[PDB]
């Protein structure tokens, strides 16, 4: 099959989960393999962030230290003097991938196991968050912390952005967030034709990890989940964004 391929052109194992939430229709592939989640995370932590704060919460300023600040932090780096509010680091965590961002939201939800807590409650028996940023991006094959599946991430994502796990207000804040995603522009975006409205959170890991979680919008149509996930053999492998557009590519045709 087209999946197969992409995986021997790219030398990458592929996870595939995307549904069709007006018709049940999917597209799978390795869905259920494990993959270290990586940044993809930060939606997820995000939505459990909307489940626990009002709107006005959300106005908190947070300060923080250079101390906080640790290997990827576009945004935090820049405002230790001033702090930022809790909205400003929910934004600078999902459109750049703002990993001391991610850091703090995380504390202020009870850090990862809480996080676990709460994704068990809303029915995500696999996603396994155990540590903060970076060195939650440690995922050696076989282990499981830290990591998910392409189905369990959908499904994940699916349930704050779409379902009634957020109401309608902070289910918008997410998805306008995830619209205008910086990080993403290679990946599900670079895989969908015109007119399709995006909503993705990327994720970079060891052993060449690339993931893509979005929401996409056909221009006329009910929105379809999608995770693309991605590792490679080596631990310090380089990843290739055109795996991710091009899997969307046959994600996008089988639908």
């Known amino acids: 099959d087209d999946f197969a391929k992409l995986e021997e052109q790219f030398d990458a194992k592929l996870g595939i989960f995307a549904l069709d939430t007006g018709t049940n229709?999917?597209?799978?592939?390795?869905?259920?393999?494990?993959?270290?989640?990586?940044?993809?995370?930060?939606?997820?932590?995000?939505?459990?962030?909307?489940?626990?704060?009002?709107?006005?919460?959300?106005?908190?300023?947070?300060?923080?230290?250079?101390?906080?600040?640790?290997?990827?932090?576009?945004?935090?780096?820049?405002?230790?003097?001033?702090?930022?509010?809790?909205?400003?680091?929910?934004?600078?965590?999902?459109?750049?991938?703002?990993?001391?961002?991610?850091?703090?939201?995380?504390?202020?939800?009870?850090?990862?196991?809480?996080?676990?807590?709460?994704?068990?409650?809303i029915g995500d028996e696999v996603t396994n968050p155990e540590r903060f940023e970076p060195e939650l991006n440690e995922v050696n094959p076989g282990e499981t912390q830290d990591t998910s599946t392409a189905r369990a991430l959908a499904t994940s994502l699916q349930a704050f952005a779409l379902e009634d796990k957020l109401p309608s207000e902070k289910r918008e804040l997410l998805i306008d967030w995830m619209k205008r995603n910086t990080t993403g522009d290679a990946l599900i975006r670079a895989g969908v034709p015109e007119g399709w409205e995006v909503a993705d959170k990327t994720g970079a890991g060891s052993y060449g990890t690339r993931n893509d979680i979005a929401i996409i919008w056909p221009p006329k149509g009910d929105p379809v989940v999608l995770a693309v996930l991605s590792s490679r053999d080596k631990k310090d492998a380089k990843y290739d964004d055109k795996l991710i557009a091009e899997a969307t590519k046959v994600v996008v045709k089988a639908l």
């Open 25 to 121: 229709r999917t597209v799978t592939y390795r869905p259920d393999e494990r993959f270290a989640f990586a940044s993809t995370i930060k939606a997820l932590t995000v939505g459990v962030l909307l489940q626990q704060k009002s709107i006005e919460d959300l106005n908190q300023r947070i300060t923080y230290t250079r101390d906080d600040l640790v290997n990827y932090n576009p945004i935090t780096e820049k405002h230790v003097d001033t702090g930022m509010t809790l909205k400003e680091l929910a934004d600078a965590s999902l459109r750049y991938s703002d990993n001391t961002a991610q850091n703090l939201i995380l504390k202020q939800i009870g850090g990862p196991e809480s996080l676990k807590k709460e994704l068990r409650k």
